Amino acid sequence: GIYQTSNFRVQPTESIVRFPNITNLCPFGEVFNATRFASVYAWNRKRISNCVADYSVLYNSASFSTFKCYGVSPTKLNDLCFTNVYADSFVIRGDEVR
Amino acid sequence: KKFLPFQQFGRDIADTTDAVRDPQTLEILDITPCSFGGVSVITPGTNTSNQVAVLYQDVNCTEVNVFQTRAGCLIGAEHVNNSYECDIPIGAGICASYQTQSIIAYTMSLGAENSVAYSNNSIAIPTNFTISVTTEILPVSMTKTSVDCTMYICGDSTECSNLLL
Amino acid sequence: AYSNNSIAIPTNFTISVTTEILPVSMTKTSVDCTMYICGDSTECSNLLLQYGSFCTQLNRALTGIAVEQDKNTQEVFAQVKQIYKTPPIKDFGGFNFSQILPDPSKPSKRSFIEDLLFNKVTKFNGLTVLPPLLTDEMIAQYTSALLAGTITSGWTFGAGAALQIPFAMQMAYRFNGIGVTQNVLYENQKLIANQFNSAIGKIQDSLSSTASALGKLQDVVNQNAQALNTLVKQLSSNFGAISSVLNDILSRLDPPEAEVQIDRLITGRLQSLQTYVTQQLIRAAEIRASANLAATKMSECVLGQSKRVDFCGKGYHLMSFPQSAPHGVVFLHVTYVPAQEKNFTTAPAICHDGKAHFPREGVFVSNGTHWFVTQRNFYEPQIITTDNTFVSGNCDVVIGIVNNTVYDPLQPELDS
Amino acid sequence: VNQNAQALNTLVKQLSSNFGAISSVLNDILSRLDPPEAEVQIDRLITGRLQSLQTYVTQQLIRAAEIRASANLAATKMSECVLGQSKRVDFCGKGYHLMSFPQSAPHGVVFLHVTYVPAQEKNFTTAPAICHDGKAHFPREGVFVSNGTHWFVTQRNFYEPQIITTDNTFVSGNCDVVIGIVNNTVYDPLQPELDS
Numbered sequence: 001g002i003y004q005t006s007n008f009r010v011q012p013t014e015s016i017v018r019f020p021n022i023t024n025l026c027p028f029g030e031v032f033n034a035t036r037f038a039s040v041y042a043w044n045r046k047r048i049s050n051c052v053a054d055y056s057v058l059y060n061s062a063s064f065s066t067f068k069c070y071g072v073s074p075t076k077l078n079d080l081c082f083t084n085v086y087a088d089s090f091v092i093r094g095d096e097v098r
Numbered sequence: 099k100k101f102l103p104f105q106q107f108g109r110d111i112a113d114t115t116d117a118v119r120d121p122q123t124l125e126i127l128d129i130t131p132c133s134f135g136g137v138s139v140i141t142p143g144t145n146t147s148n149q150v151a152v153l154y155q156d157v158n159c160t161e162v163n164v165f166q167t168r169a170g171c172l173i174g175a176e177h178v179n180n181s182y183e184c185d186i187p188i189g190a191g192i193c194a195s196y197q198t199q200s201i202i203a204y205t206m207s208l209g210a211e212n213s214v215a216y217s218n219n220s221i222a223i224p225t226n227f228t229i230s231v232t233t234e235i236l237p238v239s240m241t242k243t244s245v246d247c248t249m250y251i252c253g254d255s256t257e258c259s260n261l262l263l
Numbered sequence: 264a265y266s267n268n269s270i271a272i273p274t275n276f277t278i279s280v281t282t283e284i285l286p287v288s289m290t291k292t293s294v295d296c297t298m299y300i301c302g303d304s305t306e307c308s309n310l311l312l313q314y315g316s317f318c319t320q321l322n323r324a325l326t327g328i329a330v331e332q333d334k335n336t337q338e339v340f341a342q343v344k345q346i347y348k349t350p351p352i353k354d355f356g357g358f359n360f361s362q363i364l365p366d367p368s369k370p371s372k373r374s375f376i377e378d379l380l381f382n383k384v385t386k387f388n389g390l391t392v393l394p395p396l397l398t399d400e401m402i403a404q405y406t407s408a409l410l411a412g413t414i415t416s417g418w419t420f421g422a423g424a425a426l427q428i429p430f431a432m433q434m435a436y437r438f439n440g441i442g443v444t445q446n447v448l449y450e451n452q453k454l455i456a457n458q459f460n461s462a463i464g465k466i467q468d469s470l471s472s473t474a475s476a477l478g479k480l481q482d483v484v485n486q487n488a489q490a491l492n493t494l495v496k497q498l499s500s501n502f503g504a505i506s507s508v509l510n511d512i513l514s515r516l517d518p519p520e521a522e523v524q525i526d527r528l529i530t531g532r533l534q535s536l537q538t539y540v541t542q543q544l545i546r547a548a549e550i551r552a553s554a555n556l557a558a559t560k561m562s563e564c565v566l567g568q569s570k571r572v573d574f575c576g577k578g579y580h581l582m583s584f585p586q587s588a589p590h591g592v593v594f595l596h597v598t599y600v601p602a603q604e605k606n607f608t609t610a611p612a613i614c615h616d617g618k619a620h621f622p623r624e625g626v627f628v629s630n631g632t633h634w635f636v637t638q639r640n641f642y643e644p645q646i647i648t649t650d651n652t653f654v655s656g657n658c659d660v661v662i663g664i665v666n667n668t669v670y671d672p673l674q675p676e677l678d679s
Numbered sequence: 680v681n682q683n684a685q686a687l688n689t690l691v692k693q694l695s696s697n698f699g700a701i702s703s704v705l706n707d708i709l710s711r712l713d714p715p716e717a718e719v720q721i722d723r724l725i726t727g728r729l730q731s732l733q734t735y736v737t738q739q740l741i742r743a744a745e746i747r748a749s750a751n752l753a754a755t756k757m758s759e760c761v762l763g764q765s766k767r768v769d770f771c772g773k774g775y776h777l778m779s780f781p782q783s784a785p786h787g788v789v790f791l792h793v794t795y796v797p798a799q800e801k802n803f804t805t806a807p808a809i810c811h812d813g814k815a816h817f818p819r820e821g822v823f824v825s826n827g828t829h830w831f832v833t834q835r836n837f838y839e840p841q842i843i844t845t846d847n848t849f850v851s852g853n854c855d856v857v858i859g860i861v862n863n864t865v866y867d868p869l870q871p872e873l874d875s
């Protein structure tokens with residue numbers, strides 16, 4: 001007889017990666033090491049744009065008591081690309097972070 | 099494609115991206131997914147041979163003793179100009195067989211031609227007959243299976259049974 | 264206008280060609296399930312192979328259908344041992360079998376009628392369409408054989424080898440087969456060929472004007488395509504995952520927890536294949552039932568003369584001609600329909616020398632003064648004789664018997 | 680029989696699949712885990728297994744209609760072919776139907792159809808009618824044929840010729856209306872019988 005046994009599939013010959021060929025470092029330090037954080041009833045917020053965002057600098061930092069992902073995983077943050085980033089900011093009691 | 103200046107990419111009905119803009123050049127690229135298809139093995143019985151031919155379905159004879167069928171690129175079968183009854187069907191009129199040994203592949207015969215000796219004034223009449231017996235087989239019943247759905251899922255288990263209820 | 268003394272008999276008749284369309288096979292789909300559910304992910308595939316055999320079962324199920332669509336197209340058309348062919352001289356007693364026989368001028372040996380039919384009827388996700396084993400050029404050679412045997416040899420090529428017979432003598436056997444005597448052909452043979460060649464004209468006019476009749480084939484192609492397009496659209500649906508695109512989840516989540524998202528899609532997509540394959544298995548049994556009706560009509564109607572009332576259009580069946588169509592078959596049934604008819608008088612029996620007479624074929628009628636015996640399905644009044652009638656009982660036994668004189672031609676032949 | 684064997688061979692093997700659980704065995708999970716998570720493992724095995732039955736039972740329901748369509752065909756043959764004689768061409772083997780003999784088989788039936796097949800044949804010249812008095816004669820049964828020197832009437836399906844008579848031919852009209860008609864003597868039995 002004639003038997004369907006497997007599926008043939010041409011493999012990729014080479015690997016290509018492309019991003020907008022620029023170099024500005026993002027303003028993460030201006031947030032995570034800011035001179036002042038707001039009251040939570042009037043929480044502050046910065047729009048991060050037009051930049052290469054190295055997240056390894058933040059993720060490795062022992063100064064953070066928690067660092068918790070929900071829509072992504074932390075090691076992936078350097079693989080990903082975004083249209084907008086918004087960092088909201090405030091000051092609460094350490095118990096209410098939950 | 100006539101992309102409008104605001105379009106970063108285009109997509110098919112499946113939401114699969116059909117085309118893209120490059121982030122490092124003002125160019126619009128079509129994307130075609132890689133050539134693929136069923137690998138089908140054409141064989142006689144292992145009692146008779148371990149030779150096989152392979153049909154790579156829907157690929158043009160390129161990306162894999164090769165022949166193009168409309169079913170795919172057929173590898174390891176000898177094309178023949180004669181035609182025979184079907185044996186192993188391949189598709190779109192192509193049939194293959196193991197004959198003097200190797201696998202051959204051919205457009206199948208429909209049977210012999212027989213043009214009719216017709217005229218407006220002549221008839222053929224049977225002078226003699228054969229009484230012929232033919233077997234015809236029909237299935238009538240299946241095996242009367244039954245299955246205990248509860249026992250199939252939760253055998254000996256009240257824990258499970260309480261979850262199935 | 265029923266009464267116990269009245270009959271109507273056809274004094275005229277119309278040959279009609281009908282058209283009957285049956286689907287015979289589906290689009291022979293197959294899918295690589297694993298490429299549909301988890302195409303281009305070794306990790307999704309590792310999740311999917313916890314569900315075991317379902318991928319293999321669905322591939323077997325869709326293959327089981329495709330291997331049957333070859334068998335259906337074979338059992339309807341491949342009913343003949345030999346590719347019979349017509350002579351170059353079209354001596355068919357006046358019938359124009361040029362519109363339904365092959366056209367030798369085209370790349371595929373289809374007829375003038377078949378070319379109407381093929382123009383009245385209208386991707387990467389592991390999905391495929393397999394080609395039919397028989398090409399339309401092979402189907403057009405099988406309908407060439409079945410039709411060429413029908414015209415040149417009647418039903419006799421159904422039983423054994425084709426026994427040639429003149430076409431207006433085959434048609435005399437046909438007419439005789441519906442209780443209408445051989446002379447009713449020959450006394451009108453140019454009219455029968457006029458009505459027939461005109462009716463084959465009306466068929467082209469009907470098929471060329473509108474596709475609307477071929478709904479029986481087009482509904483099949485439309486249902487196959489809508490079910491395929493739905494299987495494709497359900498790749499885009501979320502099923503409650505954080506993206507429907509598998510490659511989004513493979514970029515955005517690490518394996519320890521990405522697997523809890525991807526399971527939603529594996530389960531959601533697998534239910535969307537089991538739904539499609541179930542629709543197609545119920546459908547393939549709907550097309551199987553029609554391919555078996557088509558194989559039963561081609562055996563009994565084309566390769567024979569059927570007596571099964573309204574099984575081969577309306578009228579008394581003479582013969583039918585198969586024409587191929589895309590995923591189907593079209594029968595042109597040719598039927599004798601009683602036309603002009605009038606009602607006069609009739610009787611069950613007649614009385615002679617105290618004994619009673621009954622017709623050997625036909626039924627007694629009176630024109631309003633005289634009595635005749637006519638074949639039942641066409642008006643042809645013979646003198647009542649001991650040749651046209653047979654005897655049983657006496658006048659006192661039968662309800663409604665009439666008074667009449669029977670002519671025996673042996674009386675003049677003795678008397679002279 | 681093989682399609683039902685493959686159907687249960689899969690239905691059995693679908694017990695061995697995990698469907699997302701920690702083990703394919705229900706007693707392993709209930710040896711290993713408490714209700715806070717054992718129920719959330721076992722709901723996986725139910726969602727898998729139960730879909731494995733609703734698959735198998737669907738295949739059996741569809742299949743049983745494919746067997747019922749052959750049992751109804753077999754009962755239609757045993758009605759019309761065995762208990763009768765069938766005019767339905769090629770319904771009861773290739774050839775003309777005489778009779779058929781039914782036989783039992785495992786989950787099936789087998790018919791031994793007996794058919795008459797035309798096997799040896801001769802070409803004859805033929806005409807649709809013959810002319811006598813300028814009155815035109817037609818066969819009552821069978822067909823006119825000639826060996827080339829004489830004209831005979833014979834039964835359509837087995838060559839057995841007879842000299843053409845007023846007992847074998849009926850008449851209508853005149854010889855001008857028929858197409859391709861020929862002249863030949865019709866034997867009237869009554870002339871010798873009156874003259875004797």
Ligand SMILES: *[C@@H]1O[C@H](CO)[C@@H](O[C@@H]2O[C@H](CO)[C@@H](O)[C@H](O)[C@H]2NC(C)=O)[C@H](O)[C@H]1NC(C)=O
Pocket residue numbers: 353359361
């Ligand atoms: C059978 O009838 C067809 C018409 O339906 C004839 O074909 C036509 O032939 C004439 C010349 O005699 C041409 O002008 C027409 O254009 C043809 N019609 C078409 C639609 O092509 C055919 O010749 C007839 N055949 C016989 C044997 O009588």
Ligand SMILES: *[C@@H]1O[C@H](CO)[C@@H](O[C@@H]2O[C@H](CO)[C@@H](O)[C@H](O)[C@H]2NC(C)=O)[C@H](O)[C@H]1NC(C)=O
Pocket residue numbers: 666
């Ligand atoms: C049909 O004709 C017959 C004669 O051939 C009629 O029979 C006669 O009926 C009368 C009474 O009406 C009797 O006196 C005669 O002796 C009968 N003769 C014979 C030969 O039977 C018969 O009655 C007529 N029937 C009808 C319905 O008109």
Ligand SMILES: *[C@@H]1O[C@H](CO)[C@@H](O[C@@H]2O[C@H](CO)[C@@H](O)[C@H](O)[C@H]2NC(C)=O)[C@H](O)[C@H]1NC(C)=O
Pocket residue numbers: 826827828829
């Ligand atoms: C056609 O058949 C007739 C018989 O039905 C043949 O004529 C007979 O030939 C034999 C042998 O010579 C004679 O003994 C008979 O007396 C002849 N019969 C008659 C009525 O003449 C005739 O020869 C056959 N023709 C052909 C061409 O074979």
Ligand SMILES: *[C@@H]1O[C@H](CO)[C@@H](O)[C@H](O)[C@H]1NC(C)=O
Pocket residue numbers: 028029030032033057058061
């Ligand atoms: C803030 O300053 C500390 C040094 O005091 C440095 O280690 C840390 O990475 C800085 N944070 C950012 C976001 O640059």
Ligand SMILES: *[C@@H]1O[C@H](CO)[C@@H](O)[C@H](O)[C@H]1NC(C)=O
Pocket residue numbers: 020021022121122123
């Ligand atoms: C990518 O680099 C090329 C070469 O310097 C430049 O011309 C192009 O505009 C750059 N593209 C983007 C999107 O910055």
Ligand SMILES: *[C@@H]1O[C@H](CO)[C@@H](O)[C@H](O)[C@H]1NC(C)=O
Pocket residue numbers: 145146
């Ligand atoms: C294969 O089948 C043939 C019968 O056709 C038999 O004679 C032969 O021994 C078989 N060979 C094997 C290896 O089974």
Ligand SMILES: *[C@@H]1O[C@H](CO)[C@@H](O)[C@H](O)[C@H]1NC(C)=O
Pocket residue numbers: 158159160
């Ligand atoms: C592939 O096959 C098509 C057949 O129409 C031909 O035109 C084309 O040039 C072929 N391409 C290659 C790369 O062989």
Ligand SMILES: *[C@@H]1O[C@H](CO)[C@@H](O)[C@H](O)[C@H]1NC(C)=O
Pocket residue numbers: 177178179
């Ligand atoms: C088949 O025969 C033709 C001649 O009709 C020849 O040109 C062709 O090369 C032959 N093909 C093979 C495979 O032998």
Ligand SMILES: *[C@@H]1O[C@H](CO)[C@@H](O)[C@H](O)[C@H]1NC(C)=O
Pocket residue numbers: 264265266269604605606607
């Ligand atoms: C029979 O049909 C004719 C019309 O052709 C009608 O005039 C006549 O009344 C009908 N006879 C009966 C008894 O209804």
Ligand SMILES: *[C@@H]1O[C@H](CO)[C@@H](O)[C@H](O)[C@H]1NC(C)=O
Pocket residue numbers: 275276451454
């Ligand atoms: C039957 O009626 C038609 C008209 O529809 C006519 O053309 C034909 O010649 C008539 N036939 C006979 C035998 O009277």
Ligand SMILES: *[C@@H]1O[C@H](CO)[C@@H](O)[C@H](O)[C@H]1NC(C)=O
Pocket residue numbers: 215222800801802
């Ligand atoms: C009928 O006559 C033709 C003449 O060409 C011949 O070829 C054919 O074999 C004859 N048929 C039989 C049954 O002898």
Ligand SMILES: *[C@@H]1O[C@H](CO)[C@@H](O)[C@H](O)[C@H]1NC(C)=O
Pocket residue numbers: 218219354858859860
């Ligand atoms: C039969 O056809 C021939 C032409 O080949 C013709 O001369 C002859 O008159 C026709 N005979 C009949 C009875 O139609």
